[PDB]
């Protein structure tokens, strides 16, 4: 056979390298200010998400990363279990 293709998958997201890093650091990473423009602060938010997306899975263009995430995010039950777990933690 030819070599099988490599893809983004929920296992990467649920890995310790994955989504927990964002929740462990996002409060410290991003910072808005009224003292800078909308365009300024708006640009700032995307920095962290871009660098994190590269570190996670360098295949593809940033937009493609988001739009790929939509499919697995809506379909996989284990990922959804993790997400309802987050919002239960806030219900705790």
């Amino acid at each position: 056979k030819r070599r099988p293709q490599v893809k983004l998958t929920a296992e990467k997201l649920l890995s310790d390298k994955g989504l927990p890093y964002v929740l462990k650091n996002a409060h410290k990473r991003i910072r808005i200010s009224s003292k800078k423009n909308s365009y300024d602060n708006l640009s700032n938010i995307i920095q962290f998400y871009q660098l994190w997306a590269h570190e996670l899975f360098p295949k593809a263009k940033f937009k493609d990363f988001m739009k790929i995430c939509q499919t697995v995010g809506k379909t996989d039950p284990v990922l959804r279990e993790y997400r309802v777990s987050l919002f239960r933690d806030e219900m705790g």
């Binding site: 293709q5 490599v6 360098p58 295949k59």
Partner: protein, 143 residues
């Protein structure tokens, strides 16, 4: 090995022949006619007059490249008079991330050495009657 050892040799090395007063062929001078095909590979001594000298130019020994997408560096070693430069990042990590990145050459981390070429010719008072004088090509590197 991570990189070729030639890339970090900061020095040059040369042999100096036997003193004839201690003496072996390397101590005994040959005229440019006596250098037969038997001597290929050996260390010898030659006596004559220099006819022309080239000016110095650089020659590559180890070439260095950068991969754009995965931010990784690779090296190539050159021995022959010509070479083909690399154009694909064959690194295993880069390959397993299916990252078909582009390679670009860099001078700032390549290794060069100084090169010069000359020619030597037999003394006119040693040419046998009715013949035309012969000559040899000399190469020089390093200090």
């Amino acid at each position: 090995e991570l990189f070729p050892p030639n890339l970090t040799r900061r020095y040059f090395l040369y042999f100096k022949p036997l003193s004839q007063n201690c003496a072996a062929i390397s101590s005994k001078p040959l005229s440019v006619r006596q250098i037969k095909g038997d001597f290929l590979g050996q260390l010898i001594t030659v006596r004559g007059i220099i006819t022309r000298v080239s000016d110095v130019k650089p020659a590559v020994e180890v070439i260095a490249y950068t991969c754009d997408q995965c931010g990784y560096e690779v090296f190539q070693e050159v021995n022959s008079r010509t070479f083909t430069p690399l154009s694909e990042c064959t690194s295993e990590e880069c390959s397993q991330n299916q990252t078909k990145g582009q390679l670009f050459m860099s001078t700032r981390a390549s290794k060069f050495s100084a090169f010069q070429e000359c020619k030597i010719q037999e003394l006119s008072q040693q040419v046998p009657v009715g013949h035309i004088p012969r000559s040899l090509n000399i190469h020089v590197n390093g200090t």
